[PDB]
C-alpha cells in the first residue's frame, strides 16, 4: 500500500513547481497518516484533512464535486487542527510478536 505509489513520486515530478512539489512532499505525510478502513466507503475525511497544512489549491478545485446535491457528501468535516494523528499505522489486522531491527 504505497512504495509503488511512492515510487511513482520520484520520477513523475518531471515538470512541476514548488506548489505541486511541496504538495506531494506534504502528501507523503498522509501516506502513513491515512488509515485503512472500510475502503472508499468512508472516503470522506481524507479530502478535508488534506487541508490540515495547506499549500494546496486542490480542495478549492474540488469545489465542482464535493458539494454536489444530496447524493454525495455535503460541506462538513472542517477540521483545521482537529483529529490529531500524524499516524503511520494503517493496519487493523492480527499480530502476536514484534520488535525493531538493531540497524
Amino acid at each position: 500500500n504505497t512504495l509503488q505509489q511512492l515510487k511513482f513520486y520520484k520520477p513523475y515530478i518531471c515538470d512541476n513547481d514548488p506548489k505541486y512539489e511541496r504538495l506531494v512532499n506534504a502528501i507523503l505525510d498522509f501516506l502513513p497518516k491515512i488509515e485503512e478502513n472500510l475502503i472508499c466507503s468512508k472516503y470522506t475525511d481524507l479530502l478535508r484533512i488534506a487541508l490540515m497544512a495547506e499549500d494546496e489549491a486542490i480542495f478549492e478545485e474540488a469545489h465542482k464535486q464535493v458539494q454536489r446535491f444530496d447524493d454525495r457528501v455535503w460541506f462538513t468535516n472542517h477540521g483545521r487542527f482537529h483529529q490529531h494523528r500524524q499516524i503511520i499505522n494503517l493496519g487493523d489486522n492480527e499480530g502476536r510478536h514484534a520488535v525493531y531491527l538493531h540497524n
Binding site: 488509515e35 478502513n37 472500510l38 466507503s41 468512508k42 470522506t44 475525511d45 444530496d70 447524493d71 454525495r72 457528501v73 455535503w74 460541506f75 462538513t76 468535516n77 472542517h78 477540521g79 487542527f81 482537529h82 483529529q83 490529531h84 494523528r85 500524524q86 499516524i87 503511520i88 499505522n89 493496519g91 489486522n93 492480527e94 499480530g95 502476536r96 510478536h97 514484534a98 520488535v99 525493531y100 538493531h102
Partner: protein
C-alpha cells in the same frame, strides 16, 4: 562471556528444576564438560547481576531469592521484601538492567525498584498513580530511560533517570493483549517509534513546552444551551467557547460531569453531589448513604434524578423525595413533563410524580432489562424480549397505560434503537448488517419487494441511535464497535465521516446537534482537539 574474555551466551531453566547453560561463541553449540552446578527448585524471572558469580532468581511466589554460582549454592538474603500481596494473582515482573556497572534496575507492579550492590533496599520510585500489569518497555541507547506504567490503555508513561517527568505522549490510545513493547535507538537523530498490544505503532517527538496531559482529559461533556457550543472535560470545568483557544485548569477530581440547561453549574464530588449557581463553597444537602457514581440535572427546576450505589436519591431546593422501592437504578433520562420514568436493574420501570404520589410505583413487568426512549405522546420501552408502547393519561400523573404495539423480533435481538422527531413512527432494526423502517399500525414485520429501506454495511454489535435531520432521509450515530453511516428511506446515498481516530468511545456517545437548526457537529474520543465542523 566466561570463556574467551566475543559474544553473549544463553541460559535457562527446564522442568528438570536444574539450571541449563549454553556456550556459543561462533556458529553451533558446544556444551563443554559439566554444568558444574545446578539450581534448587525453579523460578520465573532469572538474570545475571553485574558480577558473573551471582544470579538473581525470581519465582512465581513473588519473593526474592538467590543461588550463588560460586562459593556454595544457597547462601543468604531472603530477608525484607516490600509487599507479598499482589493486586491480582500473577507471577513476578520483568527484571531489567542499567548502563552502570553497579546500579541495577527492577520493576514490581505499580512500583519501580532501583537496586545496587550490597544486599538491597536502595532506591524506590513511582511516576504517579493509575488493570493488571503485563506489558513493559525499555531503552538502551536513549540513555536507559525506563518505559513503564500501572495499566495505561491511554498515554503510556516514560520515566527519565532520577527525575519524575513525562516527555512522552500517546494520541493513538492502545489496547492490551501481549507484553511486547520497545523503542528504536534512532541512530543519532531523535524521535521515537514503538509497537504494542493493539498491533499498531506509535510515533512521537519528545520536543514540547509542557507535559502532564494524562489526568486532565479522559471523557468529554457539553454545556446544554440554545445555539451555543461549550464543551467540558475531565477535572470538572475547563472553560471553552466558539473559536477561542483559551483554556483553564482546575481539578476538584470529579467522577462524571453533567450540565444543567442554564448557566447554573451541576457537578459531583467524591461521595456526594453538588448543585450551585457558581462554585465557591458549593452548598448542598443529601440523605445519600454511600458514594454516587453519576448525577445529572433536568431542564426544568423540578426535582432531580441519578443512579447511586444505593437506594437513596438526593435532590436540592425541592421537597418530596422519590418513593424508591428499588434495589439500584441503572438508566436515567430527562423530560420536561412533571412525570419522569426511570429504568431499573430489576427491570421494573418507576413513575416519579413531582411533589406528590397518590399512586404506587410498582410495575415488575419482566426480569429482562429495560431501556427506553420517547417520541411525543408515547413512552417507548425496549426490553430484552420485546418492545412495548404506553399511552400517557396525563403529564401530571401516570396511573394506567394502554398497550399499542408489541412484537417478538428475530433471535439475537438488537440492544438499543432510536426514533426521529416530528414523525413518531415504528422502527425496528436487527443488529447485524440490516436495518428496517416500519409503519406504526399494530405491528409490521413485512418488507419484501414493495420497497427497499436503507442498508447496513458495517455495524454488528452495540447499535446505538438515530435522529431527525435536514430534508434528505435520516441520520444514525455512535462510534461504539464501528462507525456511523447515512442511508436513504427509499434509496441509497452517501454516508458521513469516520469515527474520529481512537476506538473505545467514551461513556456518552450522544452527538451535539439542533435537529432543524443543525450547523456544528462535535465528536471526539479522548485527547482529540476542537471538534467544530460546520456548513456554508
Amino acid at each position: 562471556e566466561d570463556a574467551g574474555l566475543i559474544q553473549l551466551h544463553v541460559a535457562f531453566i527446564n522442568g528438570d528444576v536444574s539450571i541449563l547453560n549454553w556456550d556459543e561463541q561462533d556458529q553451533e553449540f558446544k556444551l563443554s564438560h559439566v554444568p558444574v552446578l545446578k539450581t534448587m527448585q525453579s523460578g520465573i524471572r532469572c538474570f545475571v547481576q553485574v558480577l558473573k558469580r551471582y544470579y538473581v532468581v525470581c519465582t512465581s511466589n513473588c519473593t526474592l531469592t538467590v543461588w550463588d554460582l560460586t562459593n556454595g549454592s544457597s547462601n543468604t538474603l531472603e530477608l525484607h521484601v516490600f509487599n507479598v500481596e499482589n493486586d491480582t494473582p500473577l507471577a513476578l515482573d520483568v527484571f531489567d538492567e542499567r548502563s552502570k556497572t553497579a546500579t541495577v534496575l527492577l520493576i514490581f507492579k505499580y512500583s519501580v525498584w532501583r537496586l545496587n550492590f550490597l544486599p538491597g533496599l536502595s532506591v524506590s520510585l513511582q511516576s504517579e498513580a493509575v488493570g493488571s500489569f503485563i506489558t513493559c518497555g525499555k531503552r538502551s541507547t536513549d540513555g536507559r530511560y525506563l518505559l513503564l506504567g500501572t495499566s495505561e490503555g491511554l498515554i503510556v508513561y516514560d520515566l527519565k533517570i532520577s527525575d519524575p517527568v513525562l516527555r512522552s505522549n500517546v494520541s493513538e490510545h492502545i489496547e492490551c493483549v501481549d507484553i511486547y513493547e520497545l523503542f528504536d535507538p534512532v541512530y543519532k537523530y531523535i524521535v521515537l517509534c514503538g509497537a504494542k498490544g493493539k498491533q499498531v505503532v506509535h510515533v512521537h517527538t519528545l520536543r514540547s513546552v509542557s507535559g502532564s496531559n494524562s489526568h486532565q482529559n479522559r471523557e468529554i461533556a457539553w454545556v446544554h444551551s440554545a445555539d451555543e457550543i461549550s464543551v467540558m472535560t475531565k477535572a470538572c470545568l475547563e472553560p471553552n467557547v466558539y473559536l477561542r483557544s483559551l483554556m483553564d485548569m482546575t481539578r476538584e477530581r470529579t467522577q462524571l460531569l453533567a450540565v444543567d440547561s442554564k448557566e447554573r453549574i451541576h457537578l459531583i464530588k467524591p461521595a456526594i453531589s453538588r448543585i450551585s449557581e457558581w462554585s465557591t463553597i458549593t452548598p448542598t444537602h443529601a440523605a445519600s448513604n454511600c458514594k454516587i457514581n453519576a448525577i445529572s440535572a433536568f431542564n426544568d427546576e423540578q426535582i432531580f434524578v441519578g443512579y447511586v450505589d444505593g437506594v437513596i436519591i438526593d435532590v436540592i431546593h425541592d421537597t418530596a423525595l422519590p418513593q424508591q422501592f428499588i434495589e439500584e437504578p441503572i438508566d436515567y433520562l430527562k423530560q420536561v413533563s412533571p412525570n419522569i420514568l426511570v429504568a431499573s436493574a430489576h427491570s421494573a420501570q418507576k413513575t416519579v410524580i413531582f411533589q406528590l404520589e397518590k399512586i404506587d410505583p410498582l410495575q415488575p413487568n419482566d426480569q429482562w432489562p429495560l431501556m427506553m426512549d420517547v417520541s411525543t405522546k408515547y413512552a417507548s420501552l425496549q426490553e430484552g424480549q420485546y418492545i412495548i408502547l404506553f399511552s400517557d393519561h396525563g403529564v401530571c400523573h401516570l396511573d394506567i397505560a394502554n398497550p399499542s404495539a408489541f412484537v417478538k423480533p428475530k433471535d439475537s435481538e438488537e440492544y438499543i434503537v432510536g426514533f426521529d422527531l416530528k414523525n413518531s413512527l415504528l422502527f425496528l432494526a436487527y443488529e447485524n448488517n440490516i436495518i428496517d423502517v416500519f409503519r406504526l399500525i399494530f405491528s409490521c414485520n413485512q418488507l419484501r419487494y414493495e420497497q427497499i429501506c436503507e442498508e447496513e454495511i458495517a455495524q454488528k454489535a452495540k447499535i446505538s441511535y438515530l435522529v431527525a435531520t435536514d430534508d434528505g432521509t435520516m441520520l444514525a450515530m455512535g462510534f461504539e464497535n464501528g462507525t456511523l453511516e447515512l442511508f436513504a428511506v427509499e434509496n441509497r446515498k452517501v454516508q458521513l465521516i469516520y469515527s474520529i481516530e481512537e476506538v473505545h468511545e467514551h461513556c456518552i456517545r450522544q452527538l451535539l446537534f439542533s435537529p432543524c437548526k443543525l450547523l456544528l457537529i462535535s465528536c471526539a474520543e479522548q485527547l482529540c482537539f476542537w471538534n467544530v465542523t460546520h456548513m456554508r
